[PDB]
Amino acid sequence: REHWATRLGLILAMAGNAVGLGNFLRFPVQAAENGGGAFMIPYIIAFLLVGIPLMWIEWAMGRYGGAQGHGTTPAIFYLLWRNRFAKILGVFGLWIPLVVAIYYVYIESWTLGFAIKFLVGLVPEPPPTDPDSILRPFKEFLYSYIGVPKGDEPILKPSLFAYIVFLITMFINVSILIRGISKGIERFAKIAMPTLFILAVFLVIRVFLLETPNGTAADGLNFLWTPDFEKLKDPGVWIAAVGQIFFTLSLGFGAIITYASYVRKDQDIVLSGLTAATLNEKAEVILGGSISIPAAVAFFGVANAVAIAKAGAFNLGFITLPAIFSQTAGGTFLGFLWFFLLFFAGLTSSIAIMQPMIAFLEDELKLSAKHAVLWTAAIVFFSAHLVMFLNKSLDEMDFWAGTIGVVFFGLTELIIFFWIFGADKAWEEINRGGIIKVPRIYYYVMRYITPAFLAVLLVVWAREYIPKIMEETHWTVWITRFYIIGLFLFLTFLVFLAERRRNHE
Ligand SMILES: CCCCCCCCO[C@@H]1O[C@H](CO)[C@@H](O)[C@H](O)[C@H]1O
Ligand SMILES: CCCCCCCCO[C@@H]1O[C@H](CO)[C@@H](O)[C@H](O)[C@H]1O
Ligand SMILES: CCCCCCCCO[C@@H]1O[C@H](CO)[C@@H](O)[C@H](O)[C@H]1O
Ligand SMILES: CCCCCCCCO[C@@H]1O[C@H](CO)[C@@H](O)[C@H](O)[C@H]1O
Ligand SMILES: CCCCCCCCO[C@@H]1O[C@H](CO)[C@@H](O)[C@H](O)[C@H]1O
Ligand code: NA
Ligand code: NA
């Protein structure tokens, strides 16, 4: 089996797994529309009671499976619990990352396309003022790029440039993945993560210098870091905070598990996993939190910045921030640096999100790495046309896989590993080879607190929020639901074929 060459490479690959579009696009929007500091108390609590313990669990399951030649949850779940239902539940550890890849890589390709256009100066001219005179040309810029519908049809018409840039983006992902773990993902992470840190630090510094009649960057830091215990009893904030923790740490994606399956059997995962987790949180709250929100608050004030964050998921990062930069000297180049930052953040995460299907094809169907990567890329590339051309298909997949799926799968993998497999054997397996030991209090968190916390959360989710999405949606969401259900059936069939290969073997 392939293995990570160096410990630093391991940590930077896992940190690039986690540090992605979630840190720089998702976190600012979720924090802003949930009260800023009101969001941070649940967020910190979720990191300590959900994020960290699940990170260790996924590292442990991955390393455990990899020692036996399996890096994905169909096989690993069965190793933990020899029951055919374990294999079926394990399909989610391929389905979730595949579905997320199908829209994540497309969004990643937007950042490359914008980076190219901002570098070359093919960007809107804001007229020398009225805020909508500033925002409108950049709103139109994004809408023409992805082809937002202008009539009543729920159809997207992305520009030719956007489509070609998606092909290029897929080619870049393949170019890394096809070289494998140590020579591909690991080598690239050692280049991309330092670049990523430097770009973000420079952007934070430039943003902190922003000052207008409406405020300063410091006003945004105060909005984000001022506790607000009013919302502390609002269910929606807790669901938001825990969803962000899952998404940003790549938990419930099967992707931490697959990366860890290339960790040598006796190599530490306690300190490694903790470091990857803490690195992501620093990049999230310090770097991600210090760019978009402080810039928007400085130029528009808090109330308008909040309204902007509530406008959409891409309004802050693809419209508002480039519009703000356009009002500064060298602002188009600053836009390029922002979108190049997002591209590298996305690329290091999308190679991680596609490696689970690659590992399954290699491990269970015994494909060569080349064939496993190309077939995975073909599946993602083909399926992405749904996200490219059907309005709000992106949203539906991000919901079932990227939002509900990861939380459900996180609870599932914990129950399998810490209840069925055995809490004491799971605890033994986590700490084996540890450079440090997991704090003892965390045994009771993982066995009792984390599962109760996630179960309560999933209950209120399905009772007080899901019915709206099941009855209050446009009919075209059934196209996307139909297709991703088909994907689950196709993957279940591949698990079936992998079973019968190992029986005829
Ligand atoms: C083989 C993939 C199955 C679906 C066929 C997709 C064909 C893509 O079609 C292309 O989309 C671009 C972006 O809007 C347009 O610029 C081009 O006019 C169009 O040819
Ligand atoms: C970004 C690296 C090169 C790939 C992008 C080049 C493909 C852009 O293609 C261009 O799109 C526009 C469509 O009207 C027009 O400029 C031209 O028809 C076409 O050459
Ligand atoms: C299945 C994925 C969406 C396919 C729509 C992309 C093409 C949109 O553009 C279409 O290109 C077609 C040929 O490529 C032509 O038949 C259409 O007349 C033309 O409008
Ligand atoms: C995977 C594709 C999801 C659905 C996207 C359909 C894009 C439709 O695209 C266009 O629609 C026109 C009607 O307005 C038709 O004349 C053309 O067939 C087609 O080019
Ligand atoms: C959700 C629980 C948050 C965990 C906070 C970190 C706990 C570290 O706390 C330490 O735990 C060690 C147990 O091994 C003990 O040796 C120490 O007495 C204690 O200080
Ligand atoms: Na992240
Ligand atoms: Na990343």
Q: What is the DSSP code string of 219-256?
A: HHHHHHSS--TTGGG-HHHHHHHHHHHHHHHTTTSSHH
Whether 154 contacts 387, CB under 8 Å: no
Mutate to test the pocket of ligand 3, among 146, 385, 388, 480 (most ligand atoms within 8 A of CB): 385
What gap in Å lies between CA 472 and CA 470, rounded to an integer?
A: 6
After what residues is the chain interrupted, C–N > 2.5 A?
Answer: 128
Expressed in angstroms, the distance from the first to the final Cα of the chain is: 19
Provide the token pair at 7.
Answer: 């410990």
Whether 255 contacts 61, CB under 8 Å: no
What gap in Å lies between CA 111 and CA 104, rounded to an integer?
A: 11
Q: Which amino acid is at 221?
A: L
Provide the token pair at 368.
Answer: 């060569």
Provide the token pair at 491.
Answer: 């993957």
Mutate to test the pocket of ligand 4, among 103, 146, 155 (most ligand atoms within 8 A of CB): 155
List Cα–Cα distances, 190 to 174, 193, 238, 360, 499, in angstroms. Answer: 18, 6, 35, 25, 37
Closest CA to 242 of 418, 37, 54, 419: 54
Contacts of 463 (CB under 8 A, 6+ apart): none
Q: Tokens 């139909």 identify what position?
A: 482
The residue contributing the CA closest to ligand 2 atom 18 is: 160
What gap in Å lies between CA 291 and CA 316, rounded to an integer?
A: 11
Provide the token pair at 101.
Answer: 């890849």
Give me the domains of the chain, ranges plus CATH numbers.
Answer: 7-504 (1.20.1740)
The residue contributing the CA closest to ligand 3 atom 10 is: 157
100-137 exposure pattern, b = at least 16 Cβ within 10 A, e = fewer: bbbbbbbbbbbbbbbbbbbbeeebbebeeeeeeebbbb
> How far is C-alpha 115 from the chain's CA centre?
20
Q: Is the CB of 136 under 6 A from ligand 1?
A: no
368-388 exposure pattern, b = at least 16 Cβ within 10 A, e = fewer: ebeebbbebbebbbebbebbb
145 Cα–ligand 3 center, Å: 17
265 Cα–ligand 5 center, Å: 26
Binding residues, as ranges, are: 84
Q: Which amino acid is at 466?
A: I
Resolution (angstroms) equals 2.1
The residue contributing the CA closest to ligand 3 atom 4 is: 389
- Experimentally, the structure was elucidated by X-ray
Whether 295 contacts 214, CB under 8 Å: no
Ligand nearest to the CA of 116: 2
Ligand nearest to the CA of 147: 1
| Helix 369-389 vs helix 477-504: crossing angle, to nearest 10 | 170
The residue contributing the CA closest to ligand 5 atom 9 is: 439
Provide the token pair at 438.
Answer: 């997991």
Ligand nearest to the CA of 279: 6
47-85 exposure pattern, b = at least 16 Cβ within 10 A, e = fewer: bebbbbbbbbbbbbbbbbbbeeebbbbbbbbbbbbeeee
List Cα–Cα distances, 244 to 164, 226, 442, in angstroms. Answer: 31, 19, 21
Binding residues for phosphocholine, as ranges, are: 84
Q: Provide the H-helix boundaries in 158-227.
A: 160-177, 187-208, 217-224
List Cα–Cα distances, 205 to 32, 198, 222, 282, 457, in angstroms. Answer: 21, 11, 17, 16, 38
> How far is C-alpha 493 from the chain's CA centre?
27
Q: Which amino acid is at 203?
A: L
Q: Is the CB of 7 under 6 A from ligand 1?
A: no
Whether 26 contacts 406, CB under 8 Å: no
Neighbours of 452 (CB within 10 A): 11
Ligand 5 pocket: which residues have CB below 6 Å?
A: 48-49, 439-442, 445
Closest CA to 201 of 290, 293, 262: 290
What gap in Å lies between CA 51 and CA 279, rounded to an integer?
A: 13
| Helix 160-177 vs helix 92-120: crossing angle, to nearest 10 | 120
175 Cα–ligand 5 center, Å: 43
DSSP 23: I
Mutate to test the pocket of ligand 5, among 52, 441, 448 (most ligand atoms within 8 A of CB): 441
Whether 218 contacts 19, CB under 8 Å: no
Q: Which amino acid is at 458?
A: L
Q: Which amino acid is at 135?
A: L
List Cα–Cα distances, 174 to 107, 184, 355, 413, in angstroms. Answer: 17, 10, 11, 29
Radius of gyration of the chain from Cα atoms?
Answer: 22
Provide the token pair at 466.
Answer: 């899901």
| Helix 217-224 vs helix 292-300: crossing angle, to nearest 10 | 120
Sign of the alpha-carbon dihedral angle for 495, 346, 401, 264:
positive
What gap in Å lies between CA 421 and CA 81, rounded to an integer?
A: 6
483 Cα–ligand 7 center, Å: 27
Q: Tokens 């410990």 identify what position?
A: 7
What gap in Å lies between CA 403 and CA 450, rounded to an integer?
A: 17
Ligand nearest to the CA of 52: 5
Whether 187 contacts 179, CB under 8 Å: yes
What is the DSSP code string of 293-311? HHHHHHHH-HHHHHHHHHH
Question: What phi-psi label fits residue 6: left (phi over 0), alpha (psi between -120 and 50 degrees) or beta?
Answer: beta
What gap in Å lies between CA 184 and CA 33, rounded to an integer?
A: 38
213, with CB counted inside 10 A (0-12, 13-18, 19+), is exposed
What gap in Å lies between CA 99 and CA 255, rounded to an integer?
A: 13
What is the DSSP code string of 371-432? HHHHHHHHHHHHHHHHHHHBTTHHHHHHHIIIIIIHHHHHHHHHIIIIIIS-HHHHHHHHHT
